Amino acid sequence: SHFNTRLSRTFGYTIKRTTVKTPSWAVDMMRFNINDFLPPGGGSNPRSVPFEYYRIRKVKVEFWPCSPITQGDRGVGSSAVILDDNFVTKATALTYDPYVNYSSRHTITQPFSYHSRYFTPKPVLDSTIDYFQPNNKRNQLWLRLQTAGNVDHVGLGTAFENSIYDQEYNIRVTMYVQFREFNLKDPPL
Amino acid sequence: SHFNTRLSRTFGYTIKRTTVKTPSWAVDMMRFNINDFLPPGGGSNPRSVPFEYYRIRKVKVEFWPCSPITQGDRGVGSSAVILDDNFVTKATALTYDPYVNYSSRHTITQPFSYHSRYFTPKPVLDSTIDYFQPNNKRNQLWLRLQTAGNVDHVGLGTAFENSIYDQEYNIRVTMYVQFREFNLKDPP
Amino acid sequence: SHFNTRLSRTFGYTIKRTTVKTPSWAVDMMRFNINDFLPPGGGSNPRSVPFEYYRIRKVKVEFWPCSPITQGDRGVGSSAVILDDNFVTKATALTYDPYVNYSSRHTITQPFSYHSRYFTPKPVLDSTIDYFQPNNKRNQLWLRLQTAGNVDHVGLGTAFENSIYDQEYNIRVTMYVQFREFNLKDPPL
Amino acid sequence: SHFNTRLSRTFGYTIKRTTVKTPSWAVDMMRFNINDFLPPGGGSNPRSVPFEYYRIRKVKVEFWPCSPITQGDRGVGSSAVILDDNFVTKATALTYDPYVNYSSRHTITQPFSYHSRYFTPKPVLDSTIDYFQPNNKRNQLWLRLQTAGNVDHVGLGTAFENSIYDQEYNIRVTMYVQFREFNLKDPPL
Amino acid sequence: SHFNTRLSRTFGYTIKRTTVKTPSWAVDMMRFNINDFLPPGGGSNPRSVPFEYYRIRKVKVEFWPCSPITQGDRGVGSSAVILDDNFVTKATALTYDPYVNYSSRHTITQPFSYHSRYFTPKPVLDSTIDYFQPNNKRNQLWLRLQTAGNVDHVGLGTAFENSIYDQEYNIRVTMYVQFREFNLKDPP
Amino acid sequence: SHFNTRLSRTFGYTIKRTTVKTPSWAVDMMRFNINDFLPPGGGSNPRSVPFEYYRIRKVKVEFWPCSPITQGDRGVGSSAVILDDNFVTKATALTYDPYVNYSSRHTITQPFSYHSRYFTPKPVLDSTIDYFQPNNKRNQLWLRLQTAGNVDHVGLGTAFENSIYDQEYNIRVTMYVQFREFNLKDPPL
């Protein structure tokens, strides 16, 4: 009846070099949607894992640095966990790191170091009120596993210190998902 | 403050005879809405149970067969608990039983045997996301008892093997409802 | 099977000023009928609580005074529990408190004090013999919940000392009613 | 990191005098919205408390009578807790107290008595279905602290008995709020 | 890291009426193949469950009778478990029940009764030699889950007594399968 | 109510390259003012946290180097904790490390190594006498949270060995502050 597993994807992230002489920050964000982890299935089974319900238990975000350990103009930034879908506005060179004081902030060391965050994300159930459940096991909502309109889950704010060089990362995101209700259809012939 | 009780209703259901040779299934669905269990009130008490809030603790679905124990071309099918309001599409003769592999499937025996299911159903709170609470007691959402526009609760998918004969049933649905906040008005 | 609840109604009561000089009392009486607490329902459920039988466990009579704490010509009277439906004849200015010697008498203070009584009342089953059951829990009679012609229960004699001024009360009566046998009918449409 | 705190505001309420001779009740209602307790902030901290999320643990509604203890035509009303945003229709002189039989009812004494209610209110999350969580602690929904458009929380029905006099109160609402996720921005210059 | 589940299918079986007057038996066989339970998937996930390996733990063969409990010319047959893929030759009216003395034989009551067998079947690994493992759990072979042409497992010989009437059945086959090695692909 | 929290800010520091032959030290200093951590408020809540009083428990000073770990001409320097606002005089290239024998000295490794200090700083109460309290919890002076002209706290002296290459750091200063007496004003509208 229940199936625990782990799903992953890796995409590129560049912070383009700047020439601002004062410390600045590249502010951005990250949501998580199961459509980017589970491709569509086939025939009478529209998704590739044949289950009717899911809930995302945990997300791990890993920033795998591309820069060599020889690279200079090293900086210091912040990742914070944003559970209400209310991120700081996307900015190229903000004059301060807007996430540093966040209670959930962790320091990102730049540009040749790993960084990861691991936490329970929340679904965006109503973007007007922006409400979510307390971090939990037994009482977490079950969601329908849809084919294509899956609800955004929510997650992570970032501010990377700008540099005189480019700072490239491979980002790997991994969802620890609990699926429920085996639904495999089996047509004949 | 609380009131636990049980509301029932009965309706007919006929699977119509077919001539298709090979096995085939009549796929349907079932929802439960308190509108059908709870008639309106009168005057200042707009509902027959004078309470402000309720939740549905359990639904029991009973299929009481009409066919006699003598009837042939007996079949086998499935019921499944669908808590997300995403049922298999309605179908007169699907070439397989699309519910048979469901985790929540129970076997239905046809045409002259009883079948029942008993589970906690879920309200349809947002049909786009289709979210629901884990099976629980004290943490279950309370709902407003509305005179008319009450929310669908969600439940049961079905597949009856088609037959050379008609297969008629009386379906008795029973909700075990918890009501809260007695609200009786008493004009003069 | 059992539903224990509480139903209330509030009504006006005025004791009109006099200019008799000698102390004199307004004598009256109080019955309790579920018709006054339970309106009619609609359709196939002719009463507003859908039960077949009932009995009244306790009644509470509250005299809420309207007169201000500054009102003079204070006076003294009596409330008595009368379970046999035989109240003292109603009177405007009787020359004594006809209830002061009753075993169940409690003293009413006038005209700005609260006064409450709490007791098991009895149904008026045969007004000629006027018999009733001893105050008791498991053995108390069950009565059919009628729409229309519910039986009086019986309870309270009052004698308020009259005064140079008007004495006004809001009276709130509360029945603690046990209901039995859920009977809800559910027609279609 | 959480911060518990208490927030208050005070406003007037008047029940205008009437000449209706029979007992009648002024019926109204109270919702609670955090926009009225937390003013707007300044600069890059939009809200005067720099937290990302809140939830309302408790609400105290206090009715502070203005009328002096010498006032006459005293009355008796009702407060009830309404958690589904479905109150009785506002009415100047209803012929009964519509809230007296409510399970959550408390008696209100008029016109010179203090009345409080204290309880967990509920956010108005969908006014079509009007659902809410059972009164809990650690499972309670978290909400985004908005600058402008916060969600009503829901709460209190009232029925005051009408009077030959004006009946004034200062009402003081007080929200016991829990805030979560410190988020202070510190731009430079 | 592992995933137990259950997969089911149903099909018809008819034993056509005869007028041979002395007792005779309709003799047949049953093999089980996971292609019939587990359809193709999509894209880069060629199977509808994304596992690399499986093994079949157990099969249940359920003969659900179609004949009504009123039907006469009732008879008596045999099922047997054949683990080595060597069944008695298919026959219409064999003059004895060739499975009745088999150690694994169970009795089949005809025509209106349920019958089931539940056992560990075996893969057909080499059909010249026809070897198989002792019924086990932790030493049981893993097999690749193929898209295409999965290996038969082996299983059930039947012998139903013939009748003056037709004898129809819905046969339900159920595979308790254990999958291993989640292998889901996720192209962008 | 006490509210315990953390406030940070980051700024650049560059030691400019020299061609002095012999070992020389760039001597400098650091004070901490909450002005630089807490932007102003708005309306009747003139500061971004709404508390009347504060004291600084602890400061973290972090030197996050910019130079790569490949850089040569490495050196060795000193930090020291100066609680009496009496720092060695600022100097481009002093011919010794003036803080090496301080009791509170920690060794700094240059130019690619992190360095931190964590200590209880002291307010500058009277810079004629320069007095401070011994490091404590329950006895530390409370100070008023001012909008504009808060009191320098004091702290850290630095001596970095000069180099043939430049040596940049991002410096992150973090104040662990305890605030007391919630004071939020809530006007209407």
Residue numbers in the entry:
A (entry chain p), C (entry chain r), D (entry chain a), F (entry chain 9): 43 to 231
B (entry chain s), E (entry chain q): 43 to 230
The paper states:
Currently, PCV2 is the dominant pathogen causing PMWS and a number of associated diseases in pigs, severely affecting swine production worldwide. Notably, PCV2 capsid protein (233/234 amino acids) encoded by the open reading frame 2 (ORF2) of PCV2 is capable of self-assembly into VLP and resembling the icosahedral morphology of the native PCV2 virions. The PCV2 capsid protein is the only protein responsible for PCV2 capsid formation and the dominant immunogenic host response. In literature, the crystal structure of in vitro assembled PCV2 VLP derived from N-terminally truncated PCV2 capsid protein was determined at 2.3 Å resolution, whereas the cryo-EM structures of in vitro assembled full-length PCV2 VLP was determined at 9.6 Å resolution. These structures show that PCV2 VLPs are assembled from 60 copies of PCV2 capsid proteins with the icosahedral symmetry and several exposed loops located on the viral surface, which may serve as the immunodominant epitopes eliciting neutralization antibodies.
Instead of replacing the NLS sequence by a non-NLS sequence, we completely deleted the N-terminal 1–45 residues and replaced them with a fused N-terminal His-tag “MGSSHHHHHHSSGLVPRGSH” derived from pET-28b vector to make PCV2-His-ΔN45. As expected, no stable PCV2 particles were observed in solution, as confirmed by TEM, DLS and analytical FPLC. Single-wavelength high-resolution diffraction data was collected in Taiwan synchrotron radiation resource center (NSRRC) and scaled to a space group of P21, with the cell parameters as a = 194.12Å, b = 201.88Å, c = 231.28Å and β = 90.72° at the resolutions of 2.8Å. Surprisingly, although PCV2-His-ΔN45 does not self-assemble into particle simultaneously in solution at relatively low concentration (no more than 2mg/ml), the crystal structure of PCV2-His-ΔN45 showed that PCV2-His-ΔN45 capsid proteins indeed self-assemble into VLP within the crystals. At such conditions, the crystal structure of PCV2-His-ΔN45 displayed an icosahedral VLP structure consisting of 60 capsid protein subunits with clearly observable 2-fold, 3-fold and 5-fold axes. In our crystal structure, the interpretable densities for the PCV2-His-ΔN45 start at residue 43Ser, and the densities for most of the surface loops, such as loop-BC, loop-CD and loop-EF etc, are clearly visible and easily traced. Although the extra 20 non-authentic residues “MGSSHHHHHHSSGLVPRGSH” were introduced to the vector expressing PCV2-His-ΔN45 protein, the traceable non-authentic sequences are only two residues long 43SH44, which are located within the interior region of the PCV2 VLP. Remarkably, in our crystal structure of PCV2-His-ΔN45 at 2.8Å resolution, the traceable fragment 43GIFNTRL49 (the numerical is based on the authentic sequence NO.) is located along the 1st β-strand toward the interior core of the VLP.
